[PDB]
Amino acid sequence: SIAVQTHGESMLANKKDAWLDSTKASRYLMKTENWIIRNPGYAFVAVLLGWMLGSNNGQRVVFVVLLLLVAPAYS
Amino acid sequence: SIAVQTHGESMLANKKDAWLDSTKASRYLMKTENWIIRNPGYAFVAVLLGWMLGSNNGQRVVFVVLLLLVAPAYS
């Protein structure tokens, strides 16, 4: 749908507020946060898969963050 | 918005089409494909970074897919 086609940050200089700048943080996060609060059990499996995939803790953390981001986005 | 808060597949057993089933495949994919084809240069970033922070071809492909999916979402 068109609602997912957010215009985004404008290209002008614009020392002012854009159309819906009050939602500049509400956007991009609200779907993810509601999905995570209403799917707490996915966090456990994402964390453990991130642990198992990553050779090192630096890779494990990145895997965990990426798994926690992708599933709420495409669900 | 609210169209970002899309109702999922119903839990009812339904041998019938849901409310908007013509778009069932395209709802979760239009943003990703549009963003990818409008930003071809991000693909090289994704492949290069995923090839770097990985340790073998097994998790490099997972890193590339995860990065190529996380960025079209959240714009």
Added chain:
Amino acid sequence: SIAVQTHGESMLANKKDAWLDSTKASRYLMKTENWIIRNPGYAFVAVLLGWMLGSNNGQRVVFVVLLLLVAPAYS
């Protein structure tokens, strides 16, 4: 207002006595005195754990003092 939010010492240069300076030495320690008085068993157990947590003797003393101070302040 909430009486635990005492204004405290002003940074204004003042040689008089501020509001209620008859209680500077009592408004920070009155709650703690009654409480150690009414709960000697906590004093005993605080001494025990302070001794047990301290590899060194000064560490033991510091732990005992902190344990004796924290609990009365938080009821």
Added chain:
Amino acid sequence: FNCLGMSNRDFLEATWVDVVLEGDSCITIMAKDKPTIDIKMMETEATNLAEVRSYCYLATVSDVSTVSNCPTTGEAHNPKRAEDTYVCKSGVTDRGWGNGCGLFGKGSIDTCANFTCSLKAVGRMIQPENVKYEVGIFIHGSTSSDTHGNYSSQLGASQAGRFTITPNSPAITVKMGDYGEISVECEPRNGLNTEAYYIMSVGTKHFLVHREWFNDLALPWTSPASSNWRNREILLEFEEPHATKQSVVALGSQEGALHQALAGAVPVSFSSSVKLTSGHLKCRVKMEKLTLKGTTYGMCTEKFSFAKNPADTGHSTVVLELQYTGSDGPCKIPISIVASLSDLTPIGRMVTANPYVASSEANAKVLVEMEPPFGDSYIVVGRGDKQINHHWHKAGSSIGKAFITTIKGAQRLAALGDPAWDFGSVGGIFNSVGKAVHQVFGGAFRTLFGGMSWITQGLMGALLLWMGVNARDRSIALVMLATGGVLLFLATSVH
């Protein structure tokens, strides 16, 4: 009440049987020494719905005012902030000697706009006591093609019954004439999980929606029988402050946005009661008192003709309509499926158990359904010089048949979950223990992957297959491969 011409049809073969009636499906039961039964759920109905919450999706703005204070006068206060229908927001503007202030910097403004809802979507809830299931039962007696789907005629012949299953009437027994009686006892409280759904009404469209989705809807909302709106600021936009008048606009109608968000919800009909065609109902069909006629009529000896030529129904059965020119009376119809005309031994199974002409009027029409075997066979009607032979080919094989039923059973497990083990069940121990394993494992599965869509299910399953292929412990590998296969099956089966 019967299923000839339905695409979703099931066939079932100690004296009762447990069935799950799905919304757009039918079940055909052929027991050992019983007439054939057709059972289906036509419709679910809920009569007394109670409003829970209304969401405004179109609102207007009618009176915008602004009040200002100089950078050292404190927060601005607008009088309309003491009125219910006004939404107020505090902003910051540039103030200085040009405007009239005594100082420079950020002065404080307060803007209030009158809020009025034009169009709202109303949510309602269903009590389980008010759910009615419409269930149709049919006995394959003597019917014609036009009579076969006419309930009035089938009721007048004591071959069919339509009844209502409610929590206060979970069991019925319908009279089937000389076939006896057939009973059902159902579990209405387990059918429609009313505690998981709301009925949304947007304009003239009505949907069955999840309660968790409905509660998270980001719109201004009000309680039943109240005009006090909450979260109104979602529908309003305050543009740039001006320090004397800051404009406030209302966003456009969110009806299309709501319709896009409602994707996946189940459309329903709600004029006075919610009508619904999906869902499921677990019942037990009791055929202890159901019997065959107990008398045979004697062969029809006159000439037969095909009123409707044999036609494939699509479910491995062939149906035809005979016309009888005789006028002698009720007689048994000579009709069978044979392997060849040299050996007239019947080989198939008869859906119409004992076809017969029910009336004594000439030119009677009788519908007969049969299950021929795979390959070539012959429909034989009559004997001697009046015999009509019709060659029938049935494509497929028993191996492909078993494969297709395995796929269909897997899809039934996916769609129904736990009552899938109650489908065609006769109370075996294996069914019970498998049902319990399904309880625990599916509960865990819904705990871990419950909220996922099909694309994320497919990606997660692909990851799980990759991890199980390269695993090490060979036991965690087994379970990860299993859950990956399940996730791939769920991802693929939705298309």
Added chain:
Amino acid sequence: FNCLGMSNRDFLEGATWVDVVLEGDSCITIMAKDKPTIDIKMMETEATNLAEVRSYCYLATVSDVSTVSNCPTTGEAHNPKRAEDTYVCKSGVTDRGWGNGCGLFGKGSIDTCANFTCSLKAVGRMIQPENVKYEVGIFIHGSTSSDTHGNYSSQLGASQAGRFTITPNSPAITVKMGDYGEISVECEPRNGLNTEAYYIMSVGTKHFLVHREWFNDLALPWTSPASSNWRNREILLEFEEPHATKQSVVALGSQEGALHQALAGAVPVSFSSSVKLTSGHLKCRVKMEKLTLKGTTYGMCTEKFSFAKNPADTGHSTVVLELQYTGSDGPCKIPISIVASLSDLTPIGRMVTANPYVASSEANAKVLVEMEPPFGDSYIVVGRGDKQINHHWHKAGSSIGKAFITTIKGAQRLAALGDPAWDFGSVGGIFNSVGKAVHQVFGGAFRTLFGGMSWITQGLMGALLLWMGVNARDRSIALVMLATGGVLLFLATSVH
């Protein structure tokens, strides 16, 4: 035209010309040695003759729905309304049998056609570069009171201000400034508003400057400027459950709110009859070789002054005040200065109202004086002897903190204006042009690799880049990753 009381202003120190970048709602104050102080700002920009490029339908209706049905194994149905342009037609399949009216059983094809009509459409128009029209205000500080400093009519009657039009046809003009001389500007309106990355989208009474790529990718039924035939109409239609004779088609609800949600980030503009907005940038060159001081031979005022309006802080490390003159001497210079202490009266700081003076000869004349004191304590002294009046003033910050603030302001100016940022307050030189060019190449390499990203994605990318660079090798890839991560995090935080 004037920037006093404006929350964001830039100070430029003057060498006969200086090139500035006028931003949307901002002003520049230029002080030059032995020159009147000037301030210049872009008041607005305009576009006059726009042409429609594309209409999108966001509210549509269905008029009459027909279904043509075929029996099983008879092939596709082909509703005959597929030959009419206004009808949207979809092919489905439904259960058929003896009960329906077929001689066979199975899936029979149907074709449903519904008459499409657009009720409400959003119109996107383009701007031709020759029709852009910038409004520029210039003001010589001169002698003003507090009540006429912002009044354009008074400042025009005093030949101390002028608002004028910059057009690609006439990119350079000169304003007469009375006894101050002439002030010239040569601008680049063509290099201002891009005009090729933007459309003006009108939805109802709301108008937005939007990116062309976003507008062209919008997932709504669309048409051509004068066309009445629509494409991708199935976006706004829902074909309900197939039925052997009557499949129902429902128009979706109005998408106006969904469009407003999608417009999040576009720049609101006013389009009563021409597009107007106050949000762009314009590179100009201010030439002031013909700008001269006025009243060089007035002589100092002799009577006593009084603070008519007490010294107030403007928020830009500057102080404004208003004096009243008891004397009727005539046009005379005001003896006002900033001193470190009331002993050792040597002047410090810098007047922003250069050479403040009393304009007229009548008494009780009020003069606005605005100056920049140094950090710490200072005294505003006007008069000498027994008529001297003093004001104690304190400036809170420090030189190093101001340097850091200027550094972050320049960084965010680079983030906003990109390459024109080097054109800001420059006088040429091998440094600025080389720096500008390397900024151009790095900006291209950065926009082709990380463009089209929101603040969250670029913040997470910066976090990843910092992590990898800290853990990297070769000390050369690591520097690149550190730089990119730092820039990405700065950009992510710059929108908050």
Added chain:
Amino acid sequence: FNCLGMSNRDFLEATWVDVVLEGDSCITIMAKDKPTIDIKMMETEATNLAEVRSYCYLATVSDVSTVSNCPTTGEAHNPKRAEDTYVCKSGVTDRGWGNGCGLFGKGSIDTCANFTCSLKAVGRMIQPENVKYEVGIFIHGSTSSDTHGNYSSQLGASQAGRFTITPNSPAITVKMGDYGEISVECEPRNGLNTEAYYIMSVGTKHFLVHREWFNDLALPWTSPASSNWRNREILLEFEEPHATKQSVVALGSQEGALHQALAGAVPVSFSSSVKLTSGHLKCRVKMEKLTLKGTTYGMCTEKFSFAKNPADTGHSTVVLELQYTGSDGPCKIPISIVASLSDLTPIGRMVTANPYVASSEANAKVLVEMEPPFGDSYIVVGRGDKQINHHWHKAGSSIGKAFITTIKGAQRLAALGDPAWDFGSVGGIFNSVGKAVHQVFGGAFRTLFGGMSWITQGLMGALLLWMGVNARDRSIALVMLATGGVLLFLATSVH
């Protein structure tokens, strides 16, 4: 405007001196060839106060109502929840067939009560341009005991002056008759940090409060010129729910709890304007136009007597009052301090420089005060038959005086911070470098330990001393020891 009779007093020696006019102190300057000067700050005054916030400490509950719904109907909504002056809370309560419900369980109630503020504490802001400091200057001319302290008589002798210092008049020159002119330039914007304080008025009591503390009260509060109270339910208690009526009570008056929270704030008087006597004001006293009086008259020839016997002040000075019996107009008093009666060399400097009789009538009283050296000395007036001697003993020593001066400078550094380096400054470089290195290590110190109290400061100082003595690196050990010593000194100096 005099230093006499004040327990706080300091003594100072090109021709300008930097002083800090502390709130309840007095400064005596004794330059080389100038009359003795007494300078002191008398009262600070803020004129036009602007309200910033009002806190409620006494609330009223007027009209309480409750609305209840059945255990599954949905959240209740009181019709009063829209109205502005009503505080409304949602509770949950047991419901069943005995309560009128068709179901059982936890139903929802909504309770609304009318909030009203009865008593309010008002915070106000001071603009630095409205602060004015009253400063008193006095010259030790010829005074009596009663007139030394009467401004109406010292001004009439051109020996004193009260002047107001504002940001718009930061420098004042006052004529002193025959002594010339004494001028002062001050820094009124640095005296009272109005950016860090509010004036809180509760009842008839007024306080100078920290802005952070004032903004952090947990009470219902409004904006200025508004009755839109918020956080109202701070003063409300909702009793146990009953589904038909839930009681709401107002918590008792918080005036006393507010007084207890105000501990450490500075009381002020705010009848019309805010008047204060604490604080400080940094000034520069210019004495170049200050000259010793041109005195043509000779010494007094007649007999003197001690009208008031010599008295010891608190600051190593002696004050006495002489009675002059002669009537030969104004004349100089032959009074001095000697080590012994054989060596009449004047050894002790006199604070009342060049004392003299001012009147011409007989029996004139003259106040003379002076600084004798440590140990025994004699105040001698006259010679020969008219000579009168008085034995004075001044207890103490130079070492003890130096140590007391050091500790008093320590308290000065504590009280003033950075302006303490400008006290008794004639410019210099050590003063400026010390002030610069005190601006740092004085902001960092108040960043790490700014908000502590005396008991926390003492505990932290003891811990830091222990860590420093137990440390290994001498640099970190020394810095820990220094910060611990400072913290203990500050913990101790409050008593």
